[PDB]
Amino acid sequence: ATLKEVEMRLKSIKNIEKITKTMKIVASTRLSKAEKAKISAKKMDEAEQLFYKNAE
Amino acid sequence: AEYFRDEEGQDVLLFIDNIFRFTQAGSEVSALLGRIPSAVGYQPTLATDMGLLQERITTTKKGSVTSVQAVYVPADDLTDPAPATTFAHLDATTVLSRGISELGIYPAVDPLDSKSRLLDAAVVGQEHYDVASKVQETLQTYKSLQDIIAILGMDELSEQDKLTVERARKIQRFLSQPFAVAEVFTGIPGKLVRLKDTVASFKAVLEGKYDNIPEHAFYMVGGIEDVVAKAEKLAA
């Protein structure tokens, strides 16, 4: 009643914890690929920036 | 009922309402009888009184009696010992949950919680069982997915999951069927569909033969013929 309404709310909180945990891990997985792309891209950009700098 | 079962030797079809009142009644006079209160104030003779009632109802060498006993489960706490004791003693449980009523589904029968041991792959044969096994899994998955859908939404879900969700919603509203006695309480003509026909109609749905049919064209209508007809109605 109190006990059950607490308990269901606590179960909800547990499920929320689980989802946020899961999400955090998947986010890390995605993050590695994201970083990999950004290096290669940034290198390419830097070559163009080389013109803009030298051109002043 | 005994007179019918035994002496007239006929079949019967007992109906009792509401058996929580039977428990409750015994509980009230328990105090007066001076018996020390048992759990949640119930009579200490709760078990044996239930037992006498339940045992009296049976299918003997003579008659056969089909009881349908209503039970009122206070605040839907089936854990409550009086409902729980009755839950054991009854052969073919059906749970009708408030939520399902609120979903607008009439029957209010909660499919997950309604369970009867009469369902078997021998009793109703392999096809019936297998079809129902697919239904059970589909719904249970859908329930599991509710948490994901709640925060994340339809995002992390697979294509397979999306089809399962769509099927579950279709099944959820395919179950919805109007009652003849709710041509007054809902004013929709009642629909009774024969069992073989229902198995077939559900089989088709699961195969996805009618997953091109709108979700609301499964809602509160009978058989596949009706579902298709309501699809035509919505189409028009």
Curated annotation (Swiss-Prot), chain A:
Disulfide bonds: none annotated. It is found in: Mitochondrion; Mitochondrion inner membrane. Mitochondrial membrane ATP synthase (F(1)F(0) ATP synthase or Complex V) produces ATP from ADP in the presence of a proton gradient across the membrane which is generated by electron transport complexes of the respiratory chain. F-type ATPases consist of two structural domains, F(1) - containing the extramembraneous catalytic core, and F(0) - containing the membrane proton channel, linked together by a central stalk and a peripheral stalk. During catalysis, ATP synthesis in the catalytic domain of F(1) is coupled via a rotary mechanism of the central stalk subunits to proton translocation. Belongs to the ATPase gamma chain family. Present with 28100 molecules/cell in log phase SD medium. F-type ATPases have 2 components, CF(1) - the catalytic core - and CF(0) - the membrane proton channel. CF(1) has five subunits: alpha(3), beta(3), gamma(1), delta(1), epsilon(1). CF(0) has three main subunits: a, b and c. This is ATP synthase subunit gamma, mitochondrial. The chain holds residues 34 to 89 of 311 of the full protein.
From Swiss-Prot, chain B:
It is found in: Mitochondrion; Mitochondrion inner membrane. Transmembrane segments: none annotated. The modification Phosphoserine is found at residue 101. It comes from the Eukaryota. F-type ATPases have 2 components, CF(1) - the catalytic core - and CF(0) - the membrane proton channel. CF(1) has five subunits: alpha(3), beta(3), gamma(1), delta(1), epsilon(1). CF(0) has three main subunits: a, b and c. Present with 164000 molecules/cell in log phase SD medium. Belongs to the ATPase alpha/beta chains family. Mitochondrial membrane ATP synthase (F(1)F(0) ATP synthase or Complex V) produces ATP from ADP in the presence of a proton gradient across the membrane which is generated by electron transport complexes of the respiratory chain. F-type ATPases consist of two structural domains, F(1) - containing the extramembraneous catalytic core, and F(0) - containing the membrane proton channel, linked together by a central stalk and a peripheral stalk. During catalysis, ATP synthesis in the catalytic domain of F(1) is coupled via a rotary mechanism of the central stalk subunits to proton translocation. This is ATP synthase subunit beta, mitochondrial. It comes from Saccharomyces cerevisiae (strain ATCC 204508 / S288c). The gene is ATP2. The chain holds residues 273 to 508 of 511 of the full protein.
